[PDB]
Design a protein around this ligand. Structure first.
Ligand SMILES: *[C@@H]1O[C@H](CO[C@@H]2O[C@@H](C)[C@@H](O)[C@@H](O)[C@@H]2O)[C@@H](O[C@@H]2O[C@H](CO)[C@@H](O[C@@H]3O[C@H](CO)[C@@H](O)[C@H](O)[C@@H]3O)[C@H](O)[C@H]2NC(C)=O)[C@H](O)[C@H]1NC(C)=O
Ligand SMILES: *[C@@H]1O[C@H](CO[C@@H]2O[C@@H](C)[C@@H](O)[C@@H](O)[C@@H]2O)[C@@H](O[C@@H]2O[C@H](CO)[C@@H](O[C@@H]3O[C@H](CO)[C@@H](O)[C@H](O)[C@@H]3O)[C@H](O)[C@H]2NC(C)=O)[C@H](O)[C@H]1NC(C)=O
Ligand SMILES: *[C@@H]1O[C@H](CO[C@@H]2O[C@@H](C)[C@@H](O)[C@@H](O)[C@@H]2O)[C@@H](O[C@@H]2O[C@H](CO)[C@@H](O[C@@H]3O[C@H](CO)[C@@H](O)[C@H](O)[C@@H]3O)[C@H](O)[C@H]2NC(C)=O)[C@H](O)[C@H]1NC(C)=O
Ligand SMILES: *[C@@H]1O[C@H](CO[C@@H]2O[C@@H](C)[C@@H](O)[C@@H](O)[C@@H]2O)[C@@H](O[C@@H]2O[C@H](CO)[C@@H](O[C@@H]3O[C@H](CO)[C@@H](O)[C@H](O)[C@@H]3O)[C@H](O)[C@H]2NC(C)=O)[C@H](O)[C@H]1NC(C)=O
Ligand SMILES: [Cl-]
Ligand code: NI
Length: 304
């Protein structure tokens, strides 16, 4: 049992892999039953025909990035019988909608550099082993509640999109969240309290104003780095003493309030901030009081 499409290469030393990448292919051949790894990247494929993977029920990897696939030419239920699929690469195509339904066994999903306009609420239903989701460089306007059920998700990249609203609910294991270069103008009260293990957040180049925030929005005990540069902030939003890096350059901040870092300062209460950028705002260095180091006791680099 070693049949192989003529346009592809199947190594004898590794009979469960099939290489069809970078060959000017125009369509997908039907995959042999034994295959676990298939590589179709960097061709001129335009469609994923119905039933293409139905013989290979043991597929783990599918690489389809770097083609010209459109959403109307993704076959019906084409991924449905692949109940062990772990990794799927669909970045750099011509997709306008989320493909699906997707197998509940997925661990990584790449969908960046397409033209996806929206993530419906049920688009990622049941993917409880998904650890990384790449969606940057699309035209997404909203994702709704699609992220709530992803119990294993560590990384979510939504940067360089058209987001008007932050995701309505975050999963509990999330550590990295990137949403820079979007159109966010509001963030709700206690938004990050639902993500106990969140470490890195980027929200630069959006349309944030203090009136669109709550007092405690960015006060979270888990955060290490927070990037909010080039918004339209007039005041330093309050933060937790655990925060280590804060970027606020290119805003409209017109006062230095020490109470944004520490509500009370004593021998054991103080900010652990190491890096702080406040340059490109409406304050001079003299706006920072002489006794500021009592609060910012660890600040090694402060730019104003
Ligand atoms: C996709 O899969 C089909 C069917 O797979 C068959 O059913 C599965 C449940 C497994 O048990 C497979 O092992 C099994 O093959 C493949 O078609 C099948 O091809 C084989 C040839 O290797 C056919 O067997 C032969 O059939 C002739 C005619 O009856 C006999 O004279 C021979 O003695 C021998 O038995 C088998 O009949 C055929 N099955 C069907 C339903 O047509 C198909 O090749 C495969 N495609 C790829 C690309 O892998
Ligand atoms: C899949 O998408 C590619 C790329 O689409 C490009 O990026 C998008 C974000 C939009 O901005 C699109 O407007 C943009 O094209 C498509 O490739 C594109 O094909 C068209 C023709 O089909 C190309 O236009 C030509 O451009 C040359 C100059 O190089 C002119 O001389 C021609 O007269 C003609 O106008 C376009 O340049 C090309 N873009 C890229 C980046 O290669 C692709 O067609 C599409 N595939 C499907 C199946 O929809
Ligand atoms: C979500 O993922 C879990 C667990 O995945 C596991 O953990 C990873 C870190 C890796 O180590 C993976 O290799 C590993 O599978 C899935 O649960 C697992 O399901 C498989 C069935 O496909 C179970 O296989 C069994 O394993 C036992 C040995 O304990 C054998 O005796 C059996 O014959 C059978 O092969 C596996 O045990 C099970 N693991 C756990 C920890 O539950 C889960 O299926 C997956 N979710 C979805 C929807 O696919
Ligand atoms: C950032 O957030 C911390 C902690 O926030 C606490 O936990 C959240 C989940 C919410 O439930 C908050 O409501 C809650 O306060 C803030 O630290 C907290 O500051 C308050 C002062 O407003 C402390 O409360 C006071 O404590 C004294 C002495 O115990 C009492 O006498 C007072 O009556 C009053 O209750 C609170 O103890 C303190 N918590 C911790 C864990 O340190 C922090 O102020 C905030 N930062 C900014 C800039 O707003
Ligand atoms: Cl980039
Ligand atoms: Ni880019």
């Amino acid at each position: 049992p070693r049949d192989c499409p003529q346009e592809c290469d199947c190594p004898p030393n590794f009979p469960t892999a099939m290489y069809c990448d970078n060959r000017n292919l125009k369509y997908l051949p039907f995959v042999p039953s034994r295959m676990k790894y298939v590589y179709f990247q960097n061709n001129q494929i335009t469609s994923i025909q119905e039933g293409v993977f139905d013989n290979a029920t043991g597929l783990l990897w599918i690489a389809l990035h770097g083609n010209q696939i459109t959403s109307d030419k993704v076959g019906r239920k084409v991924f449905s019988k692949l109940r062990h699929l772990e990794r799927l690469y669909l970045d750099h195509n011509n997709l306008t909608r989320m493909p699906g339904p997707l197998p509940r066994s997925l661990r990584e999903l790449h969908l960046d550099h397409n033209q996806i306009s929206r993530v419906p609420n049920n688009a990622l239903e049941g993917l409880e082993n998904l650890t990384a989701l790449y969606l940057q460089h699309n035209e997404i306007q909203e994702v709704g509640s699609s992220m709530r059920g992803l119990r294993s998700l560590i990384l979510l990249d939504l940067s360089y999109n058209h987001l008007r609203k932050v995701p309505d609910g975050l999963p509990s294991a999330l550590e990295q969240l990137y949403m820079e270069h979007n159109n966010v103008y509001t963030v709700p009260d206690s938004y990050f309290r639902g993500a106990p293990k969140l470490l890195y957040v980027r929200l630069s180049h959006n349309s944030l104003t203090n009136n669109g925030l709550a007092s405690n929005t960015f006060n979270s005990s888990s955060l290490l780095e927070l990037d909010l540069s080039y918004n339209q902030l007039q005041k330093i939003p309050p933060v937790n003493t655990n925060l280590e890096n804060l970027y606020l350059q290119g805003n409209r901040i017109n006062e230095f309030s020490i109470s944004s870092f520490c509500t009370v300062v004593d021998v054991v209460n103080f900010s652990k901030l190491q890096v702080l950028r406040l340059d490109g705002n409406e304050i001079k260095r003299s706006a920072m009081p002489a006794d500021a180091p009592l609060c910012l006791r660890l600040a090694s680099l402060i730019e104003i």
